[PDB]
Ligand binder design. Structure first.
Ligand SMILES: CSC[C@H]1O[C@@H](n2cnc3c(N)ncnc32)[C@H](O)[C@@H]1O
Ligand SMILES: N=C(N)NCCCCNCCCN
Lengths: 280, 269
């Protein structure tokens, strides 16, 4: 092979591969291994513990479906909480909603933020302001999201944009966490989290769904073809109050200028292989 | 050992492989079979994945059933390509089918699939001997075939098959009502090809539809295009007939979710 190659291997021996121009950096923080590559045709790739977090040319296919469905389904998302999202893509999308007054971002690994702000740069300067407490609506907090949620409440929308549930993110998918998360939501409130590869992390998705189903008033599932991840990726939604996640404010969405998630066709967001639906 | 198919922009689909089973150069292309570690056998043509046996239904179901279930009475069906037999197997799951003609250019693909892949449930063997009750195999070019054949309730393309002339003939070959459906490539990596086909079909068919589905074995999602003749509303399918199929991937009860498609692509139509 004349050029480099980055591959993330998934269960069953399936791999997502990218031709790369070079490796920009590798750093071992106290929590995980953070790496950055310059891909041949998808911009920069950020990886944590060998798993793709994003590719700069395509990351909107993940941040849009992760953020906007919930934000557009909530009648008035004024106070938002983001757990993880060290790269700033999620908060960037959240801040597109005028109703937003405050967004608290809890990241456990500050190195991810520093590295993203310096080498990824999809946040459009948001992370730097966050790092120096100079952002008007965003407030950065370095710590574990599980602990935070155990001591904080009052959120219209909670967005969990963490790594896979293995390292420090594992408890973000625990029964007790969902209890605290539900309690932390306002009425009406909405909780959303990425839930793994539909086809290869099916157990992760099913497990989290059943746990959320025992806590939230209503639990929804959906999927979206995320560029850079085994496709498609699943998302789980937990609602408190009278929120009809089956409906979103299309007019507010039109103002977002989205490229991937289509709020006008919100009903198509719920695609899911039949065999999996039958297991719910 | 690994098998990787590379797509535009250096994106790759990779499978860990246990062993290579066969390599044969037919008169048309190079055909290879590998046994993967966790996805069954992989049929590769000129280095491209035709299918992996543990996942191919994720492609053959959405390719076939939506159109078969949207049509009021699919008695006579045409399939262009589908040498692996996955499509014909799915078509024959519909009781209304009285005849299905399969037109394949490379006989070697059929023989290798029948012997080394075998997802077709023995259908290919019968057809290779001209002994299947409903299916009829024809070795030739689908383009020339549709130039002189008509009377199909459903036409499925699973293989010049995206030219306006071809689409005109395909439309003429359809009964009224009739449905034409074709796979249209990787949504994200072959966007231009998908758009080009969509536009040519719009100039020919009474109604044109598009949809996508998460396929295992290829850069996902995969796009599909539908051309209709007559009063068929592709946005509706017979859910009751769908239940009898026992599908694993395509969900007839949630047919509205079949039309997922990235926003920027819809805007370019
Ligand atoms: C890279 S985008 C997602 C982020 O989630 C962060 N993360 C993982 N686990 C937790 C946790 N328990 N609390 C807060 N943030 C987390 C990771 O450090 C990563 O930067
Ligand atoms: N195996 C994987 N590729 N897992 C990806 C985990 C979900 C994205 N983490 C957040 C990164 C984007 N903000």
């Amino acid at each position: 092979m004349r050029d480099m190659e980055f591959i993330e291997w998934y269960p069953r021996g399936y791999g997502v591969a990218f031709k790369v121009k070079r490796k920009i950096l590798e750093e071992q923080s106290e929590y995980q291994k953070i790496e950055v590559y310059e891909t041949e045709g998808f911009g920069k790739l950020l990886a944590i513990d060998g798993t793709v977090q994003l590719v700069t040319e395509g990351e909107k296919s993940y941040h849009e479906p992760l953020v906007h469905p919930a934000m557009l389904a909530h009648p008035n998302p004024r106070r938002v909480l983001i757990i993880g999202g060290g790269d700033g893509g999620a908060i960037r999308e959240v801040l597109k909603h005028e109703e937003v007054e405050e967004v608290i971002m809890v990241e456990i690994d500050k190195k991810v933020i520093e590295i993203s702000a310096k080498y990824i740069g999809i946040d459009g300067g948001i992370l730097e302001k966050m790092l120096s407490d100079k952002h008007e609506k965003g407030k950065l907090i370095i710590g574990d999201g599980v602990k935070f949620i155990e001591e904080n409440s009052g959120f219209d929308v909670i967005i969990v944009d963490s790594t896979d549930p293995v390292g420090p993110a594992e408890m973000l998918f625990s029964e007790e966490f969902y209890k605290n998360a539900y309690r932390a939501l306002n009425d009406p409130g909405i909780y959303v989290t990425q839930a793994g590869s539909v086809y290869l992390f099916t157990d992760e998705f099913l497990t989290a769904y059943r746990k959320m189903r025992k806590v939230f008033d209503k639990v929804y599932y959906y999927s979206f073809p995320v560029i850079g991840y085994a496709s498609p990726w699943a998302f789980l939604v937990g609602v408190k109050g009278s929120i009809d996640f089956m409906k979103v404010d299309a007019e507010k969405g039109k103002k977002l200028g989205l490229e991937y998630y289509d709020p006008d066709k919100h009903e198509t967001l719920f695609q899911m292989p039949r065999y999996i639906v039958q297991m719910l």
